[PDB]
UniProtKB/Swiss-Prot annotation:
This is Endothiapepsin. Disulfide bonds join 255-290. One of its GO terms (biological process) is proteolysis. It comes from the Eukaryota. The gene is EAPA. The chain holds residues 90 to 419 of 419 of the full protein. The active site is at residues 35, 199. The lineage of its organism: Eukaryota, Fungi, Dikarya, Ascomycota, Pezizomycotina.
Length: 330
């Protein structure tokens, strides 16, 4: 089997991407944030504290003839930005782009933090990291991909995120029309539960490539590109007036700037992030100070190849017996 679904930016800055997901019988369609940096499929629901729902579409398990409470199971998760959610668990039928899993754990939120309530466009998350990170207790649950994998034509999914435009998540096949050139595959460590790999270096604009190993994770659920402070300083030094602002929480730059591109290495191959992709717009409405899309990972504890990087590539998440990651230009 295969599946194919369109993923759409939630706003004009590509702050996140939402993909429609069918849950239950009859189908209830929710728009979920596909997150290769976590491993829980959770939804706003009829169980979510009413004051914490503000415009999201909810899953109502009592209206699904295939829903079953997973008795005794609870979940609780917190993300790198400090947001969080928690609740109980149902199993139900979940379909993405025509690919169906029966018995998928659907984690129903009883509580969500303010940043979830405040984002009316995101109805929940669909985790695509390794199932070892799933938070359900006392019986850990499998991700949608883990449950689907044996049925897929090939044990892969691909992320093809757009810059200020829709893109595609495919399951079970590699669309050879969706990228240019060849796909370069690179090793993955699953030891921390992530799609963790090592970039071979970087360049800023038209500058020379610096060969240096940069461990990090391929994370569709993180907006920006978080890299070591040395690398990030080298980038922003090429932008007149750019500075790290403790009050804003990262590098800012004059909105009048033309940002340089940023290149990262995948083996001997190179992925070029256009300067436009690094612009996250005014820090507050009407400001002439703009927020940068490349930020320091110092104090995160891991480098993160988030959407800023991934949207410049066609990315293969290869779930073969030994997982790997593939990157192609597009
Ligand atoms: C700040 C910026 N740097 C580029 N290379 S294009 C660009 C920009 N200004 C306004 C919108 N966008 C995308």
């Amino acid at each position: 089997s295969t599946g194919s679904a369109t993923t759409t930016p939630i706003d004009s800055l590509d702050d996140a991407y939402i993909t429609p997901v069918q849950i239950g019988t009859p189908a209830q369609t929710l728009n979920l944030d596909f997150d290769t940096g976590s491993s829980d499929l959770w939804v706003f629901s009829s169980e979510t504290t009413a004051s914490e729902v503000d415009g999201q579409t909810i899953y109502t398990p009592s209206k699904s003839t295939t829903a079953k409470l997973l008795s005794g199971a609870t979940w609780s998760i917190s993300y790198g930005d400090g947001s969080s959610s928690s609740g109980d668990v149902y199993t139900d039928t979940v379909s993405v782009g025509g690919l169906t899993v029966t018995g998928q754990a659907v984690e129903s939120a009883k509580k969500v933090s303010s940043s979830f309530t405040e984002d009316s466009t995101i109805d929940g998350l669909l985790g695509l990291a390794f199932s070892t990170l799933n938070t359900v207790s006392p019986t850990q649950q499998k991700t949608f991909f883990d449950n689907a994998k044996a049925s897929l034509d090939s044990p892969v999914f691909t992320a093809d995120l757009g810059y200020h435009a829709p893109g595609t998540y495919n399951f079970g096949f590699i669309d050879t029309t969706a990228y240019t050139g060849s796909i370069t595959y690179t090793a993955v460590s699953t030891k921390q539960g992530f799609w963790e790999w090592t970039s071979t270096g970087y360049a800023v604009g038209s500058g020379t490539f610096k060969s240096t190993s940069i461990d990090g994770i391929a994370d569709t659920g993180t907006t920006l590109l978080y890299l070591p402070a040395t690398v990030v300083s080298a980038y922003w030094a090429q932008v007149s007036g750019a500075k790290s602002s403790s009050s804003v929480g990262g590098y800012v730059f004059p909105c009048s700037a033309t940002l340089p591109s940023f290149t990262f290495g995948v083996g001997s191959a190179r992925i070029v992030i256009p300067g436009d992709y690094i612009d996250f717009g005014p820090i507050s409405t009407g400001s002439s100070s703009c927020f940068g899309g490349i930020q320091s990972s110092a104090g995160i504890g891991i480098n993160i190849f988030g959407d800023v990087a991934l949207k410049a590539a066609f990315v293969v998440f290869n779930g073969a017996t030994t997982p790997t990651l593939g990157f192609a230009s597009k």
